[PDB]
Amino acid sequence: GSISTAVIDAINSGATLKDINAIPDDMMDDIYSYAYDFYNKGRIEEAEVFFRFLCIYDFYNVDYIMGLAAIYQIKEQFQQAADLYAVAFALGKNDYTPVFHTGQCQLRLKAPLKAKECFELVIQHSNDEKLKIKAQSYLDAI
Amino acid sequence: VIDAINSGATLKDINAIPDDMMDDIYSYAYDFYNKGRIEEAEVFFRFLCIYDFYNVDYIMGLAAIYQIKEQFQQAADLYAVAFALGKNDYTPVFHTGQCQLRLKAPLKAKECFELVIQHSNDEKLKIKAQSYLDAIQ
Numbered sequence: 001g002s003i004s005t006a007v008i009d010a011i012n013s014g015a016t017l018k019d020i021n022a023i024p025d026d027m028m029d030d031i032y033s034y035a036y037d038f039y040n041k042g043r044i045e046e047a048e049v050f051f052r053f054l055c056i057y058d059f060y061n062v063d064y065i066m067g068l069a070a071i072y073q074i075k076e077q078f079q080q081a082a083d084l085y086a087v088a089f090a091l092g093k094n095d096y097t098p099v100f101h102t103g104q105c106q107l108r109l110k111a112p113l114k115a116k117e118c119f120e121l122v123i124q125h126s127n128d129e130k131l132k133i134k135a136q137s138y139l140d141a142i
Numbered sequence: 143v144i145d146a147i148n149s150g151a152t153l154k155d156i157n158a159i160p161d162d163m164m165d166d167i168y169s170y171a172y173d174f175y176n177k178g179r180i181e182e183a184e185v186f187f188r189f190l191c192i193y194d195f196y197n198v199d200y201i202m203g204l205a206a207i208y209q210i211k212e213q214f215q216q217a218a219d220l221y222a223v224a225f226a227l228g229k230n231d232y233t234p235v236f237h238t239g240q241c242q243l244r245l246k247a248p249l250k251a252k253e254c255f256e257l258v259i260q261h262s263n264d265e266k267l268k269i270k271a272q273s274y275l276d277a278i279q
């Protein structure tokens with residue numbers, strides 16, 4: 001998966017495609033919009049390939065990581081999604097949506113204590129009042 | 143092994159080396175590190191991360207090696223993976239902040255140390271993070 005690629009790239013420490021600016025920003029933006037065109041039409045497998053492609057080229061990009069994590073969550077690959085949401089959070093820091101979705105994933109993974117901590121984190125630190133209501137609704141059920 | 147290469151799995155997933163032997167190799171990697179045998183520690187931590195990319199302590203060991211060698215971006219990259227995988231541990235975020243300072247990105251560094259202080263339950267780590275924050279202009 002995308003995380004394995006990132007680690008192998010770091011181990012080998014050779015030149016990557018991004019290191020040589022092999023795909024310009026404007027082309028990456030286009031491929032990202034094509035990925036969502038597929039996603040929005042229900043073509044989830046093609047969207048997944050396009051987001052994997054984006055994450056091979058530029059893994060440490062919140063928008064690419066969040067798109068892929070969403071696909072994994074829909075596909076009920078909850079651990080893979082949670083792992084990617086955590087990468088997105090560590091890169092973004094100020095957006096608590098990846099924490100909220102991780103909490104959803106942890107519930108499905110039968111880890112309610114982890115899920116509770118995720119949702120409490122949202123309520124304490126997010127300034128998105130609507131996200132906080134959603135998180136509280138999950139807390140009410142645990 | 144070839145199947146794991148062709149199917150993306152880890153060597154750990156197929157129990158290619160016994161558990162206690164891997165423990166020994168990790169200990170030897172750490173011995174090299176503590177003795178300043180950085181070239182050998184790097185080989186050993188790379189070996190460990192090839193064996194199990196998903197092991198947070200293996201990743202952290204290689205990231206520390208890269209940080210010592212002043213490959214600050216490469217260290218920061220691994221620290222982001224180490225965070226995402228690990229068990230509510232903000233230590234990789236703290237070291238990312240150090241890396242960002244060395245990369246002349248003090249606002250990114252500040253956000254790292256602030257994240258540690260807002261969400262870590264490691265009091266000693268938060269003390270260190272605050273000392274860096276106190277110093278950031």
Ligand SMILES: c1cc2c(cc1CNC1CCCC1)OCO2
Pocket residue numbers: 085086087089090098099100102103113114117118121230
């Ligand atoms: C912190 C960061 C995250 C996250 C979830 C968390 C919070 N976990 C709980 C807090 C105490 C331990 C369990 O999902 C994305 O990134």
Ligand SMILES: [Cl-]
Pocket residue numbers: 094095096097126127128131
């Ligand atoms: Cl938020």
Ligand SMILES: [Cl-]
Pocket residue numbers: 212213214215216217
């Ligand atoms: Cl580097």
Ligand SMILES: [Cl-]
Pocket residue numbers: 246247248249250251
């Ligand atoms: Cl900066």
Ligand SMILES: [Mg+2]
Pocket residue numbers: 123124125126127
């Ligand atoms: Mg508030």
